[PDB]
């Protein structure tokens, strides 16, 4: 009905290796590493071809972010695992789960945030003195949407590409009902 498919900006994925790593050695022998114990208890590294950032902990846990697609995230995680293997630590690809999906879109018209906050008061939370965007907590699917006056919608919380599309399709009518002028 809407005719516009929201585009996924970010992908947060989690992977495990099952082996203990030496952060000092990884930092010294890695091209792009940032090991600051005072700052954080993990090594921050980044790769360019996928344009992604990975946080690697001493417990063998890796958190990949920045991927624009599920297969791109898979490729980035595989390359990270290969980099660690080349470093020498016993790292094997294991459970890779996407824990967060972020998407964006625009409805191409202004939206009455006060009207939405009054009509749908069980799901919306509008406090314009802190953030200039209404927060809508859709219950099914369980997702959080940020609605702005400029007609831009940000979706976050989905674990799969289906949930975010379903949420946008379910929120489009109530958004259209509250168009300014």
């Amino acid at each position: 009905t809407s005719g516009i498919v929201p585009t996924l900006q970010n992908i947060v994925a989690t992977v495990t290796l099952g082996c203990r790593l030496d952060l000092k050695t990884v930092a010294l022998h890695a091209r792009n590493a940032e090991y600051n114990p005072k700052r954080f208890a993990a090594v921050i590294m980044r790769i360019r071809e996928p344009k992604t950032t990975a946080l690697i902990f001493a417990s063998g846990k890796m958190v990949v972010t920045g991927a624009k697609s599920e297969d791109d995230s898979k490729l980035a995680s595989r390359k990270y695992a290969r980099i660690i293997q080349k470093i020498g630590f016993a790292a094997k690809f294991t459970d890779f789960k996407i824990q967060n999906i972020v998407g964006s879109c625009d409805v191409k018209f202004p939206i009455r945030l006060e009207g939405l906050a009054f009509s749908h008061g069980t799901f919306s939370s509008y406090e314009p003195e802190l953030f200039p965007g209404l927060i809508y907590r859709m219950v099914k699917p369980k997702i959080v949407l940020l609605i702005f006056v400029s007609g831009k919608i940000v979706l976050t919380g989905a674990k799969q590409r289906e949930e975010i599309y379903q949420a946008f399709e379910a929120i489009y009518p109530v958004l259209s009902e509250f168009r300014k002028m």
Binding site: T25, I87, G88, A90
Partner: peptide
């Protein structure tokens, strides 16, 4: 045992 004779081993 994690590192077979590698740079990590050194």
């Amino acid at each position: 045992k994690v590192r077979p004779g590698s740079i990590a081993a050194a």
